[PDB]
Amino acid sequence: SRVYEAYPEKKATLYFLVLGFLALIVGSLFGPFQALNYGNVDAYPLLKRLLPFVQSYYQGLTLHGVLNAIVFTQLFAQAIMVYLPARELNMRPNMGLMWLSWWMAFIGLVVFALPLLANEATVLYTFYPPLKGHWAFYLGASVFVLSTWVSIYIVLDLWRRWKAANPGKVTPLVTYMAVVFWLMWFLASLGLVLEAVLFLLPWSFGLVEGVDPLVARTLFWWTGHPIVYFWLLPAYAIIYTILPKQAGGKLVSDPMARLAFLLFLLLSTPVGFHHQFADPGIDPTWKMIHSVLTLFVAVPSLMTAFTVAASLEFAGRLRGGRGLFGWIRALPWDNPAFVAPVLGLLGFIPGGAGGIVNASFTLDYVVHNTAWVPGHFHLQVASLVTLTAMGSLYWLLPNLTGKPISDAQRRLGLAVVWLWFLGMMIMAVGLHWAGLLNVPRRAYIAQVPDAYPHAAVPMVFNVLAGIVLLVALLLFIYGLFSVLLSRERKPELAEAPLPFAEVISGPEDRRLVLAMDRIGFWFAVAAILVVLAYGPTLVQLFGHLNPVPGWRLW
Amino acid sequence: DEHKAHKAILAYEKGWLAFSLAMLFVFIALIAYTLATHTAGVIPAGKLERVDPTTVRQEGPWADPAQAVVQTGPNQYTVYVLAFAFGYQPNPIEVPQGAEIVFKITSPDVIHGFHVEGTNINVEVLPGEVSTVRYTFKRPGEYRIICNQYCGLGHQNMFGTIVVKE
Amino acid sequence: KPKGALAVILVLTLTILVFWLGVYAVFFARG
Ligand code: HAS
Ligand code: HEM
Ligand SMILES: CCCCCCCC/C=C\CCCCCCCC(=O)OC[C@H](O)CO
Ligand SMILES: CCCCCCCC/C=C\CCCCCCCC(=O)OC[C@H](O)CO
Ligand SMILES: CCCCCCCC/C=C\CCCCCCCC(=O)OC[C@H](O)CO
Ligand SMILES: CCCCCCCC/C=C\CCCCCCCC(=O)OC[C@H](O)CO
Ligand SMILES: CCCCCCCC/C=C\CCCCCCCC(=O)OC[C@H](O)CO
Ligand SMILES: CCCCCCCC/C=C\CCCCCCCC(=O)OC[C@H](O)CO
Ligand SMILES: CCCCCCCC/C=C\CCCCCCCC(=O)OC[C@H](O)CO
Ligand SMILES: CCCCCCCC/C=C\CCCCCCCC(=O)OC[C@H](O)CO
Ligand SMILES: CCCCCCCC/C=C\CCCCCCCC(=O)OC[C@H](O)CO
Ligand code: CUA
Ligand SMILES: [O-][O-]
Ligand SMILES: [Cu+2]
């Protein structure tokens, strides 16, 4: 293919996407079984007949969380947030590095997958000590995540090469998004890298006898919060810069888009004590500080809600929609690339609402470690992020492969997207309601069928969701493979421009865009904020370490 | 048209952002209120209290569950609770209604949850550390303790009991 | 004026408030 010769970045981008979607398929297989469990129905006997290596509910849950929430999301982020800026700038990524990043992720995955599949690391995707997994789990995971440091280098390189050729020009929008995104991730990632290098790796290798569980969780959640914004922002890049064109309109504000991303750079990392409201040994004053800063990290999404809604409204009016509801009806509801992110955004309304509750310190005692939490995060990552990625396939896949989407494949995609969305909404109802009734998360409750009688009603929603999502998943597998294994190839589809939206420009503040483009400065502010939010606590913890022995309770 | 739409969009967006900020600020004030009331007793103590998980069942206040409830004030009791694979001691925990209860909870093995159904007591229990929370039971009767942190294959049936006496 | 975008942020506000005040009430009930 002469296309891959001129744009080798298409092939590497394709490899990230396909590996990501494969991980999603494998992790998601466990989903309907888990939803049935939360409906008090035990279908694990059936699962074990189909997949005999599966030893427990909790091994399945480990696979589900790792493959869906760590692997799929990272690989999608590495595809989108390298390829989009590269195409905007019309520049080639360092291809040696791009391929290195892919191989690191692939090898890392293989290495941690072995112990997971062998029942040697049934510790969940948070892997809290003293539960002690096989060394290959921690090593494989470390290599997998470090793949992203290469991606950070790649994009910083593109940006600096472009700035060298264009002195005194402001960073283009998509590239601005990606630069602040990748710099945020670098700062974010240090918690886990520190946790792995200082504690988990030496411990799992048998170099040290124990690990201090409090310091391990604190370092974990330094990364564990911003990682969710790492998952979200690739979807946001698409929603701001591509969706308005798919809708038939334009992005209504470039500056407001940049501002949202800048706030994410500053506020994504210094907030992790909101995962530790119920932990001993962390001062309540510091919990309150993180609670306040978490309420602040909500502001960029509150901003996104308006900027995006106004852009969709503008599109709908351009297409002839009148009145208060006509603009909605006039949008292109026959296009899965439009429909998927929009449905995801609708579910993000209650998803965001639950997040704000979680952040509220004392209110977290009502919901912490209950089913409410999975209800919240399925709305955010399993619906918005995942749907945006599925929809992407209807424009991104042809661009990378030259393979056309037939009218029949388009209609099947609409069905998948709607069932996936609806199943997630139904399950969210079942989980939030069960959570309010004190049903714990991370629990094979179908094996204690008389323990939660008050939850009988929401349990019905969970069974229904498990069924709906099974159907959506089966249709997705069929659909993805029908595209990936189809004969036809139209090279003009691979040579077409990406559907980037035009922007409505106004007198505005060119000064605000200039101010926001002071990236080196904003990165320093972000780093300082982390030092101020984490430093005092971590000094105390490191001076009073109490390592304890590891356990295998599976 | 496009210039006019743009102007109107930015004008109303600024109004929305001020409102949303106001709303978040009101939540912060409502949280601060909780922090000044007796309901804040369930927030774990911030001070580090280290213990050795390998000797907690042999020496010290968790070694004899029948002596776990200690009167520490005129209307105050301290209760030394062990959360372990897969249960809680003592079982039941027996306390008087209307008294301030100071729970001091640790684990000899892995992390457990300590979630008292019907109350705001919801605290992580870490081996090597003492989790200290406070609560006054206004209603007598039986309260279930649920383990809400995955602790291995016994997690889903890990429960305990608090009995509040009249 | 962007009446549609305003309708969306109205739904968002009402949802946030119902969630937050709802849980606040539960917190006090369990206190
Ligand atoms: C991608 C995934 C995730 C995002 C995003 C996310 C956002 C938030 N979360 Fe969260 N969350 C918490 C707080 C928040 C807050 C304040 C927000 C905020 O960033 C949310 C702000 C969002 C909004 C305010 C919504 C804006 C609405 C929009 C943008 C839609 C507009 C609609 C349109 C435009 C459509 C109109 C179109 C038409 C056609 C009409 C807290 C603590 O404060 C905990 C710990 C709880 C505990 O006890 O363990 C927590 C736990 C989780 C966990 C569990 C971790 C574990 O395993 O223990 C995950 C995975 C998760 C993921 C995610 N979370 N969250
Ligand atoms: C077929 C769709 C899916 C269904 C039916 C499903 C269902 C479930 C259920 C019922 C739980 C709670 C289990 C428990 O607390 O014991 C769960 C956990 C989880 N889900 Fe999903 N899910 C699906 C898709 C996804 C996807 C796409 C994501 C990520 C992109 C995701 C990420 C997670 C995470 C991170 C956990 C928590 C794991 C842990 O606590 O260790 N889910 N899901
Ligand atoms: C228990 C919870 C389960 C219920 C969950 C349901 C959530 C709301 C569903 C859809 C909202 C979508 C609103 C927009 C509808 C678009 C259809 C439309 O306007 O179509 C025009 C026509 O097709 C010409 O294209
Ligand atoms: C367009 C996007 C969609 C966004 C919209 C979806 C958000 C749903 C929000 C609230 C529903 C909750 C219903 C409130 C239920 C109240 C609970 C109740 O009545 O409980 C009585 C209790 O037993 C007394 O003790
Ligand atoms: C196109 C057709 C649309 C279909 C949409 C259906 C409408 C939603 C209502 C119920 C779902 C029923 C699924 C629940 C399966 C049985 C629930 C169960 O396990 O029963 C609990 C009962 O309380 C034990 O005592
Ligand atoms: C397109 C995908 C959406 C499809 C969604 C359709 C869901 C099925 C709805 C109704 C049939 C339910 C009738 C069967 C009810 C039997 C209940 C049952 O067997 O429950 C277990 C029982 O509690 C053991 O003790
Ligand atoms: C936490 C409580 C204490 C801390 C207080 C934090 C609250 C202040 C936040 C933002 C100020 C908003 C200032 C924004 C003004 C910039 C003007 C602008 O950009 O608009 C000009 C427009 O484009 C042409 O008319
Ligand atoms: C339980 C009851 C709950 C109800 C709670 C109320 C919800 C308020 C919602 C949105 C406010 C949006 C901000 C409104 C915009 C401000 C006006 C503005 O900026 O418009 C001036 C413009 O320049 C003229 O051309
Ligand atoms: C320009 C307009 C400015 C006016 C806007 C003002 C915001 C009003 C909202 C909340 C006030 C907070 C009320 C604090 C009282 C809390 C009492 C409470 O909730 O009591 C709980 C329980 O019953 C006993 O502990
Ligand atoms: C759509 C979602 C709708 C969801 C509907 C909302 C469900 C919340 C219900 C109750 C929470 C309040 C708990 C109040 C605690 C009292 C329990 C109690 O008294 O039990 C303890 C003890 O055992 C007695 O002696
Ligand atoms: C459509 C998909 C989105 C999923 C939607 C999730 C549903 C949760 C909604 C609202 C939570 C509000 C809290 C409900 C509690 C209200 C009970 C109340 O009013 O509390 C007083 C009572 O005395 C206490 O014991
Ligand atoms: Cu102890 Cu779960
Ligand atoms: O993590 O929200
Ligand atoms: Cu977080």
Short mmCIF file of N, CA, C and O in Angstrom, two decimals, chain A residues 58 122 124 128-131 212-214 217 250 252 256 277-282 288 295 299 302-303 306-307 314 360 362 365-366 368-370 438 441-442 444 448 451-452 504 544 546 548 551 553-554, chain B residues 2 6 9 13 16-17 20 24-25 28 31 34-35 42-46 48 50-51 53-54 109-111 115 117 120 122-124 126-129 131 144 146 148-153 155-157 159:
data_model
loop_
_atom_site.label_atom_id
_atom_site.label_comp_id
_atom_site.label_asym_id
_atom_site.label_seq_id
_atom_site.Cartn_x
_atom_site.Cartn_y
_atom_site.Cartn_z
N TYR A 58 -13.95 -13.45 41.51
CA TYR A 58 -12.98 -12.36 41.73
C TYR A 58 -11.84 -12.34 40.71
O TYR A 58 -11.29 -11.28 40.39
N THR A 122 -5.13 -12.55 41.73
CA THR A 122 -6.56 -12.23 41.85
C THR A 122 -6.68 -11.16 42.93
O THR A 122 -7.12 -11.42 44.06
N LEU A 124 -7.61 -7.72 42.03
CA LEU A 124 -8.36 -6.60 41.39
C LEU A 124 -7.47 -5.53 40.76
O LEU A 124 -6.24 -5.51 40.97
N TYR A 128 -4.50 -3.72 46.05
CA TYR A 128 -4.11 -3.15 47.36
C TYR A 128 -3.34 -4.14 48.23
O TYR A 128 -3.88 -5.22 48.55
N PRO A 129 -2.11 -3.80 48.62
CA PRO A 129 -1.37 -4.62 49.60
C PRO A 129 -2.16 -4.60 50.92
O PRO A 129 -2.82 -3.61 51.20
N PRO A 130 -2.07 -5.66 51.73
CA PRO A 130 -1.14 -6.78 51.56
C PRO A 130 -1.53 -7.98 50.69
O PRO A 130 -0.80 -8.95 50.65
N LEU A 131 -2.67 -7.91 50.01
CA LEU A 131 -2.98 -8.90 48.99
C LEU A 131 -1.80 -8.90 47.99
O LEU A 131 -1.45 -7.85 47.47
N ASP A 212 3.93 -1.11 53.51
CA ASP A 212 3.02 -0.32 54.31
C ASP A 212 1.74 -0.02 53.48
O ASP A 212 1.81 0.70 52.49
N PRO A 213 0.59 -0.58 53.89
CA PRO A 213 -0.63 -0.48 53.06
C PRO A 213 -1.13 0.94 52.87
O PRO A 213 -1.69 1.24 51.80
N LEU A 214 -0.96 1.79 53.88
CA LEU A 214 -1.39 3.19 53.79
C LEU A 214 -0.57 4.01 52.76
O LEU A 214 -1.15 4.74 51.93
N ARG A 217 -1.53 2.80 49.18
CA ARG A 217 -2.82 3.37 48.72
C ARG A 217 -2.72 4.86 48.40
O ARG A 217 -3.33 5.34 47.47
N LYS A 250 -20.48 23.54 13.88
CA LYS A 250 -19.11 23.99 14.10
C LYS A 250 -18.91 24.03 15.60
O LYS A 250 -19.87 24.03 16.36
N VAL A 252 -18.28 26.06 18.74
CA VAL A 252 -18.69 27.45 18.99
C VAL A 252 -17.63 28.29 19.72
O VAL A 252 -17.72 29.53 19.71
N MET A 256 -12.73 28.50 24.94
CA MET A 256 -13.41 27.73 26.00
C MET A 256 -12.99 26.25 25.99
O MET A 256 -12.94 25.61 27.03
N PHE A 277 -11.21 9.04 51.81
CA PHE A 277 -12.02 9.66 52.87
C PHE A 277 -12.21 8.71 54.07
O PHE A 277 -12.28 9.16 55.22
N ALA A 278 -12.25 7.41 53.79
CA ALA A 278 -12.46 6.39 54.84
C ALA A 278 -11.16 5.77 55.38
O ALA A 278 -11.21 4.78 56.14
N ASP A 279 -10.01 6.35 55.01
CA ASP A 279 -8.70 5.80 55.43
C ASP A 279 -8.27 6.41 56.78
O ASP A 279 -8.51 7.60 57.03
N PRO A 280 -7.62 5.60 57.63
CA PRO A 280 -6.98 6.10 58.85
C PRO A 280 -5.67 6.83 58.51
O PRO A 280 -5.11 6.64 57.42
N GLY A 281 -5.18 7.66 59.42
CA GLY A 281 -3.82 8.19 59.28
C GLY A 281 -3.60 9.31 58.27
O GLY A 281 -2.44 9.70 58.02
N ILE A 282 -4.68 9.80 57.66
CA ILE A 282 -4.65 10.99 56.82
C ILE A 282 -5.46 12.07 57.52
O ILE A 282 -6.62 11.86 57.88
N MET A 288 -10.35 17.61 53.59
CA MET A 288 -11.21 18.74 53.22
C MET A 288 -10.61 19.56 52.07
O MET A 288 -11.34 19.97 51.15
N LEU A 295 -14.13 19.37 43.89
CA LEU A 295 -15.26 20.14 43.40
C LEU A 295 -14.83 21.11 42.28
O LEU A 295 -15.58 21.35 41.32
N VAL A 299 -15.45 21.67 37.39
CA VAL A 299 -15.76 22.89 36.60
C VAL A 299 -15.51 22.77 35.07
O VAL A 299 -16.36 23.18 34.28
N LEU A 302 -18.42 20.93 33.68
CA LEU A 302 -19.59 21.82 33.69
C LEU A 302 -19.49 22.81 32.52
O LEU A 302 -20.48 23.12 31.86
N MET A 303 -18.27 23.28 32.26
CA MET A 303 -17.99 24.14 31.11
C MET A 303 -18.22 23.39 29.78
O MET A 303 -18.86 23.90 28.85
N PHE A 306 -21.88 23.01 28.59
CA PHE A 306 -22.43 24.14 27.86
C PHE A 306 -21.82 24.35 26.47
O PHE A 306 -22.56 24.57 25.50
N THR A 307 -20.50 24.30 26.37
CA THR A 307 -19.83 24.53 25.08
C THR A 307 -20.32 23.49 24.06
O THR A 307 -20.62 23.83 22.90
N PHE A 314 -26.48 24.73 17.75
CA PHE A 314 -26.10 25.45 16.53
C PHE A 314 -26.22 24.56 15.28
O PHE A 314 -26.81 24.97 14.27
N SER A 360 -17.79 14.86 48.11
CA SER A 360 -18.24 15.74 49.20
C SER A 360 -17.90 15.26 50.64
O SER A 360 -18.70 15.46 51.57
N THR A 362 -17.85 14.03 53.85
CA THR A 362 -18.77 13.29 54.73
C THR A 362 -19.88 12.55 53.97
O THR A 362 -20.32 11.49 54.40
N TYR A 365 -19.31 8.86 53.08
CA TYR A 365 -19.56 7.76 54.05
C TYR A 365 -20.86 7.02 53.78
O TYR A 365 -21.01 5.86 54.17
N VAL A 366 -21.80 7.70 53.11
CA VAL A 366 -23.06 7.07 52.71
C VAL A 366 -22.80 6.02 51.61
O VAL A 366 -23.38 4.92 51.65
N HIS A 368 -19.51 5.06 50.10
CA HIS A 368 -18.16 4.49 49.87
C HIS A 368 -18.17 2.96 49.85
O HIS A 368 -18.72 2.34 50.76
N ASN A 369 -17.57 2.37 48.82
CA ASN A 369 -17.40 0.91 48.71
C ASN A 369 -18.75 0.17 48.60
O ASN A 369 -18.84 -1.02 48.87
N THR A 370 -19.78 0.90 48.20
CA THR A 370 -21.07 0.28 47.86
C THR A 370 -21.23 0.22 46.34
O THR A 370 -20.39 0.75 45.59
N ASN A 438 -27.03 -0.18 50.85
CA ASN A 438 -25.84 -0.73 51.53
C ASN A 438 -25.25 -2.02 50.94
O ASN A 438 -24.45 -2.69 51.61
N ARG A 441 -19.84 -3.17 46.90
CA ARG A 441 -19.20 -3.50 45.64
C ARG A 441 -18.22 -4.67 45.81
O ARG A 441 -17.92 -5.13 46.93
N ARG A 442 -17.70 -5.15 44.68
CA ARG A 442 -16.65 -6.19 44.67
C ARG A 442 -17.09 -7.44 45.42
O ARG A 442 -16.29 -8.06 46.11
N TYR A 444 -19.45 -11.21 45.38
CA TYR A 444 -20.20 -12.29 44.73
C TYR A 444 -21.52 -12.50 45.52
O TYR A 444 -21.73 -13.56 46.15
N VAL A 448 -24.54 -15.37 48.37
CA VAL A 448 -25.24 -15.17 49.65
C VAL A 448 -26.65 -14.63 49.33
O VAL A 448 -26.95 -13.47 49.59
N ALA A 451 -28.86 -12.46 51.80
CA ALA A 451 -28.19 -11.40 52.56
C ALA A 451 -28.72 -9.99 52.29
O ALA A 451 -28.62 -9.12 53.17
N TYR A 452 -29.30 -9.76 51.11
CA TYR A 452 -29.76 -8.41 50.74
C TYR A 452 -31.23 -8.31 50.30
O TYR A 452 -31.51 -7.81 49.20
N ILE A 504 -16.30 28.75 15.06
CA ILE A 504 -16.79 30.13 15.01
C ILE A 504 -15.82 31.03 15.78
O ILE A 504 -15.63 30.88 16.99
N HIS A 544 7.32 7.38 58.96
CA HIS A 544 6.66 6.51 59.94
C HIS A 544 6.14 5.23 59.30
O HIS A 544 5.00 4.81 59.56
N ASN A 546 5.30 1.45 58.30
CA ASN A 546 5.02 0.22 59.04
C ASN A 546 4.68 -0.91 58.07
O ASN A 546 3.49 -1.21 57.86
N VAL A 548 4.01 -4.53 56.44
CA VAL A 548 3.34 -5.71 56.97
C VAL A 548 3.43 -6.85 55.96
O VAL A 548 3.60 -6.60 54.77
N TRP A 551 -0.31 -11.53 51.84
CA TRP A 551 -1.24 -12.65 51.93
C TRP A 551 -1.79 -13.06 50.57
O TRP A 551 -1.97 -12.20 49.70
N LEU A 553 -5.21 -14.88 49.63
CA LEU A 553 -6.50 -15.40 50.11
C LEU A 553 -7.43 -15.83 48.97
O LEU A 553 -8.65 -15.59 49.01
N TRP A 554 -6.85 -16.47 47.96
CA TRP A 554 -7.61 -17.08 46.87
C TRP A 554 -6.86 -18.35 46.45
O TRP A 554 -7.30 -19.13 45.59
N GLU B 2 -23.75 34.04 12.49
CA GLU B 2 -22.70 33.30 13.21
C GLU B 2 -22.05 34.16 14.27
O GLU B 2 -21.78 33.68 15.38
N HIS B 6 -22.65 33.37 18.23
CA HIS B 6 -21.42 33.28 19.03
C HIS B 6 -21.43 34.22 20.24
O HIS B 6 -21.14 33.79 21.36
N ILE B 9 -24.05 32.93 22.77
CA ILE B 9 -23.53 31.71 23.40
C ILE B 9 -22.52 32.03 24.52
O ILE B 9 -22.63 31.51 25.61
N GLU B 13 -23.03 31.48 28.52
CA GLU B 13 -22.06 30.55 29.10
C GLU B 13 -21.41 31.14 30.37
O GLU B 13 -21.20 30.44 31.38
N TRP B 16 -23.93 30.78 33.16
CA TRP B 16 -23.90 29.37 33.62
C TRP B 16 -22.69 29.05 34.52
O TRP B 16 -22.84 28.40 35.57
N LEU B 17 -21.51 29.49 34.12
CA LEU B 17 -20.30 29.24 34.88
C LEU B 17 -20.31 29.90 36.27
O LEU B 17 -19.78 29.33 37.25
N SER B 20 -22.82 27.81 38.33
CA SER B 20 -22.27 26.50 38.69
C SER B 20 -21.25 26.67 39.81
O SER B 20 -21.20 25.86 40.73
N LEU B 24 -21.48 24.94 43.57
CA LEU B 24 -20.34 24.23 44.19
C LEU B 24 -19.90 24.86 45.51
O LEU B 24 -19.54 24.15 46.47
N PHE B 25 -19.91 26.19 45.56
CA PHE B 25 -19.58 26.91 46.80
C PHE B 25 -20.60 26.61 47.91
O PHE B 25 -20.21 26.42 49.07
N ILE B 28 -19.82 23.27 49.37
CA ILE B 28 -18.66 23.39 50.27
C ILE B 28 -19.07 23.88 51.67
O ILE B 28 -18.57 23.35 52.70
N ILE B 31 -20.95 21.11 53.47
CA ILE B 31 -20.00 20.11 53.96
C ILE B 31 -19.34 20.60 55.25
O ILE B 31 -19.18 19.85 56.25
N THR B 34 -21.45 19.97 58.26
CA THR B 34 -21.34 18.58 58.75
C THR B 34 -20.12 18.42 59.64
O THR B 34 -20.20 17.76 60.67
N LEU B 35 -19.01 19.03 59.25
CA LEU B 35 -17.75 18.92 59.99
C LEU B 35 -17.81 19.51 61.41
O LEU B 35 -17.00 19.16 62.25
N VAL B 42 -17.67 10.10 62.60
CA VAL B 42 -17.32 8.93 61.76
C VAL B 42 -16.09 9.16 60.89
O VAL B 42 -15.57 8.22 60.27
N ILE B 43 -15.62 10.40 60.81
CA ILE B 43 -14.36 10.66 60.08
C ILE B 43 -13.22 10.00 60.90
O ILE B 43 -13.09 10.27 62.09
N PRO B 44 -12.41 9.14 60.27
CA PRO B 44 -11.33 8.48 61.00
C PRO B 44 -10.34 9.49 61.61
O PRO B 44 -10.14 10.58 61.03
N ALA B 45 -9.77 9.15 62.76
CA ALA B 45 -8.71 9.97 63.36
C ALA B 45 -7.54 10.06 62.38
O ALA B 45 -7.15 9.06 61.76
N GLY B 46 -6.97 11.26 62.26
CA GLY B 46 -5.85 11.48 61.35
C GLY B 46 -4.51 11.05 61.89
O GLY B 46 -3.59 10.77 61.12
N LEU B 48 -1.47 8.99 63.25
CA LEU B 48 -0.99 7.63 63.00
C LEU B 48 -0.87 6.82 64.30
O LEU B 48 -0.24 7.26 65.27
N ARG B 50 0.30 3.08 65.03
CA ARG B 50 0.85 1.86 64.50
C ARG B 50 0.72 0.69 65.47
O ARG B 50 0.83 0.87 66.68
N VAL B 51 0.47 -0.49 64.92
CA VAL B 51 0.46 -1.72 65.71
C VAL B 51 1.10 -2.81 64.89
O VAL B 51 1.29 -2.64 63.69
N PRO B 53 0.57 -6.36 63.30
CA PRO B 53 -0.51 -7.32 62.97
C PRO B 53 -0.21 -8.78 63.33
O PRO B 53 -1.14 -9.60 63.45
N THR B 54 1.07 -9.11 63.49
CA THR B 54 1.48 -10.49 63.76
C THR B 54 1.38 -10.87 65.24
O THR B 54 1.51 -12.03 65.59
N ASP B 109 -4.35 -9.38 59.07
CA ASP B 109 -4.09 -10.02 57.78
C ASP B 109 -4.09 -9.05 56.58
O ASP B 109 -3.04 -8.54 56.22
N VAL B 110 -5.26 -8.82 55.98
CA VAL B 110 -5.40 -7.92 54.81
C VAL B 110 -6.34 -6.75 55.12
O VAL B 110 -6.89 -6.66 56.24
N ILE B 111 -6.52 -5.84 54.16
CA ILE B 111 -7.47 -4.75 54.34
C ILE B 111 -8.90 -5.31 54.40
O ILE B 111 -9.28 -6.15 53.58
N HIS B 115 -18.41 -1.42 57.69
CA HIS B 115 -19.55 -0.60 57.29
C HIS B 115 -20.76 -1.03 58.12
O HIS B 115 -21.26 -2.15 57.96
N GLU B 117 -24.42 -1.03 58.85
CA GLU B 117 -25.63 -0.79 58.10
C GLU B 117 -26.62 0.03 58.93
O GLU B 117 -26.91 -0.31 60.08
N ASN B 120 -23.64 5.98 59.39
CA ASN B 120 -22.55 6.52 58.58
C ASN B 120 -21.16 5.96 58.91
O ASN B 120 -20.16 6.44 58.36
N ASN B 122 -18.30 3.87 58.19
CA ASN B 122 -17.88 3.24 56.94
C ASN B 122 -16.38 3.53 56.82
O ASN B 122 -15.98 4.58 56.31
N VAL B 123 -15.56 2.60 57.31
CA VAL B 123 -14.12 2.87 57.50
C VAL B 123 -13.28 1.70 57.01
O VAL B 123 -13.63 0.53 57.25
N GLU B 124 -12.19 2.01 56.32
CA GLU B 124 -11.23 1.00 55.88
C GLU B 124 -10.35 0.55 57.05
O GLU B 124 -9.94 1.40 57.88
N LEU B 126 -6.85 -1.21 58.01
CA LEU B 126 -5.55 -1.56 57.40
C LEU B 126 -4.68 -2.31 58.42
O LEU B 126 -4.55 -1.86 59.55
N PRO B 127 -4.08 -3.43 58.02
CA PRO B 127 -3.12 -4.13 58.91
C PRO B 127 -1.96 -3.19 59.27
O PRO B 127 -1.41 -2.51 58.38
N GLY B 128 -1.62 -3.15 60.56
CA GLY B 128 -0.55 -2.26 61.05
C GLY B 128 -1.01 -0.89 61.53
O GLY B 128 -0.22 -0.12 62.09
N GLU B 129 -2.28 -0.58 61.31
CA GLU B 129 -2.82 0.70 61.68
C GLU B 129 -4.11 0.51 62.46
O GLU B 129 -4.83 -0.47 62.25
N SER B 131 -7.78 2.09 63.03
CA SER B 131 -8.79 3.01 62.53
C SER B 131 -9.72 3.38 63.67
O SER B 131 -10.37 2.50 64.27
N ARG B 144 -26.05 -4.76 61.51
CA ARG B 144 -25.10 -5.63 60.81
C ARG B 144 -23.84 -4.87 60.37
O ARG B 144 -23.94 -3.74 59.90
N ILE B 146 -20.93 -4.93 57.60
CA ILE B 146 -20.61 -5.51 56.28
C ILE B 146 -19.14 -5.21 55.96
O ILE B 146 -18.69 -4.07 56.14
N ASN B 148 -16.90 -4.28 53.19
CA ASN B 148 -17.06 -3.68 51.87
C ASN B 148 -15.75 -3.42 51.13
O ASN B 148 -15.75 -2.70 50.13
N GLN B 149 -14.66 -4.05 51.59
CA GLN B 149 -13.40 -4.06 50.85
C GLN B 149 -12.96 -5.49 50.51
O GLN B 149 -12.71 -6.32 51.41
N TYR B 150 -12.86 -5.78 49.22
CA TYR B 150 -12.44 -7.12 48.77
C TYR B 150 -11.20 -7.60 49.53
O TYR B 150 -10.15 -6.93 49.50
N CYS B 151 -11.33 -8.75 50.19
CA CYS B 151 -10.29 -9.30 51.08
C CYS B 151 -10.01 -10.78 50.77
O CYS B 151 -9.41 -11.49 51.58
N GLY B 152 -10.46 -11.24 49.61
CA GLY B 152 -10.25 -12.66 49.22
C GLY B 152 -11.56 -13.38 49.02
O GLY B 152 -12.62 -12.75 49.00
N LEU B 153 -11.50 -14.69 48.85
CA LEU B 153 -12.68 -15.46 48.46
C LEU B 153 -13.77 -15.52 49.51
O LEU B 153 -14.92 -15.85 49.20
N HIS B 155 -14.82 -12.89 51.12
CA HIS B 155 -15.37 -11.52 51.22
C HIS B 155 -16.91 -11.41 51.30
O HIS B 155 -17.45 -10.71 52.15
N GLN B 156 -17.61 -12.10 50.41
CA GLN B 156 -19.07 -11.89 50.32
C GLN B 156 -19.88 -12.39 51.52
O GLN B 156 -21.05 -12.02 51.65
N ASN B 157 -19.29 -13.25 52.35
CA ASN B 157 -19.97 -13.74 53.54
C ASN B 157 -19.31 -13.23 54.83
O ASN B 157 -19.55 -13.76 55.90
N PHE B 159 -19.39 -10.92 57.63
CA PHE B 159 -20.34 -10.05 58.34
C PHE B 159 -20.08 -10.12 59.84
O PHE B 159 -19.52 -11.10 60.35
#
